[PDB]
Design a protein around this ligand. Structure first.
Ligand SMILES: *[B]([O])([O])[C][N]S(=O)(=O)C1=[C][C]=C(C2=NN=N[N]2)[C]=C1C(F)(F)F
Length: 358
């Protein structure tokens, strides 16, 4: 691998691993379109299994980028429109507060204060209907952004209804398979269990727990190789032969709302490049990323801007992931770890690496 890439990756990540006590890590850098891989440490400490290019990590909320692109593909197929009322796809949602809440609002966290998590008490489909029927918005639609699994997760579930496919079947057949993501899963199959890393939380080995709208909001597991291919696909959507998927990728990077220097896509978030690194680094901290923020509508949305820092953080109890790329430069990075370590440390390392290579 080019010595420049070797050196900047190792000089940034080795200290990160030490400071954050990360048990295992995989990194991919995409440079001029080509992937370069790096691994450290352990997928399973007790069984002494190393991280490899085939190790599966929980992506946590990086899953939201797959959801956003699947939804974009459904729009490109003509199956849904973001301007459609939520009730068009969920007729049982009759409560009056839903008047005016569209798929766009669900996809982009702007419905008016849907909560970060679906309550753990919501176990059945009837429980889920009750939850959404009884939910009272704090704000008018399209006025404030509040990052929420219950928002984008519902978007993902409704987006696939016209196809008649389950969310998992839709994702597999419409996104994973065409992109040759053959080791990316909503449910890890028995064949791949030997590769599924444990997450580590307070020194205990853990995997994500089942919950409502988990698949849609935070449930994808993938390898560093498949994630590098995901970044390649998002860097250069016009290379994708499947027309609706090519289009769905572009729709997910459109700019729908602005808060501060950040623009909300479908799953993806974007800032203009060059970025102020303090803006993305500090902005990634959950004290900011999870706050209620007024939004400005971008009317109409700006098509994907090539000069962007496009990124998404993800976590589960045991894992921490980060992806960022800059289309204009054919440059990107994926960082997968089996510890949920602070967001700003991820963004700082990613920017140090990409800035050096840019
Ligand atoms: B995304 O990664 O930003 C969603 N974050 S979250 O806070 O909603 C979340 C959701 C679910 C889990 C989890 N379920 N079972 N194990 N972990 C964890 C988390 C997070 F807190 F982010 F880790």
């Amino acid at each position: 691998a080019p010595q420049q890439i070797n050196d900047i990756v190792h000089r940034t990540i080795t200290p990160l691993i030490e400071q954050q006590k990360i048990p295992g890590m995989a990194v991919a850098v995409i440079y001029q379109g080509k992937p370069y891989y790096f691994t450290w440490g352990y997928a399973d400490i007790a069984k002494k299994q190393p991280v490899t290019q085939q190790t599966l990590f929980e992506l946590g909320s990086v899953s939201k980028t797959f959801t956003g692109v699947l939804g974009g593909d459904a729009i490109a197929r003509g199956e849904i429109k973001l301007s459609d009322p939520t009730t068009k796809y969920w007729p049982e949602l009759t409560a009056k507060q839903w008047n005016g809440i569209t798929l766009l609002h669900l996809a982009t966290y702007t419905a008016g204060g849907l909560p970060l998590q679906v309550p753990d008490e919501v176990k059945s489909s009837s429980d889920l209907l009750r939850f959404y029927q009884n939910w009272q918005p704090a704000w008018a639609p399209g006025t404030q952004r509040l990052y929420a699994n219950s928002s984008i997760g519902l978007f993902g579930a409704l987006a696939v209804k016209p196809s008649g496919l389950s969310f998992e079947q839709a994702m597999q057949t419409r996104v994973f398979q065409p992109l040759k993501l053959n080791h990316t899963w909503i449910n890890v199959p028995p064949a791949e269990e030997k590769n599924y890393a444990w997450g580590y939380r307070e020194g205990k080995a853990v995997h994500v727990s089942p919950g409502a709208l988990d698949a849609e909001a935070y449930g994808v597991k993938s390898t560093i190789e498949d994630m590098a291919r995901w970044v390649q696909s998002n860097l250069k959507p016009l290379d994708i032969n499947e027309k609706t998927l090519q289009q769905g990728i572009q729709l997910a990077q459109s700019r729908y709302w602005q808060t501060g220097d950040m623009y909300q896509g479908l799953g993806w978030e974007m800032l203009d490049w060059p970025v102020n690194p303090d803006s993305i680094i500090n902005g990634s901290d959950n004290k900011i990323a999870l706050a209620a923020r007024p939004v400005k509508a971008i009317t109409p949305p700006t098509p994907a801007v090539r000069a962007s820092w496009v990124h998404k953080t993800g976590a589960t109890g045991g894992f921490g992931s980060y992806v960022a790329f800059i289309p204009e430069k054919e440059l990107g990075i994926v960082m997968l770890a089996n510890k949920n370590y602070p967001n700003p440390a991820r963004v700082d390392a990613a920017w140090q690496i990409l800035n050096a290579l840019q």
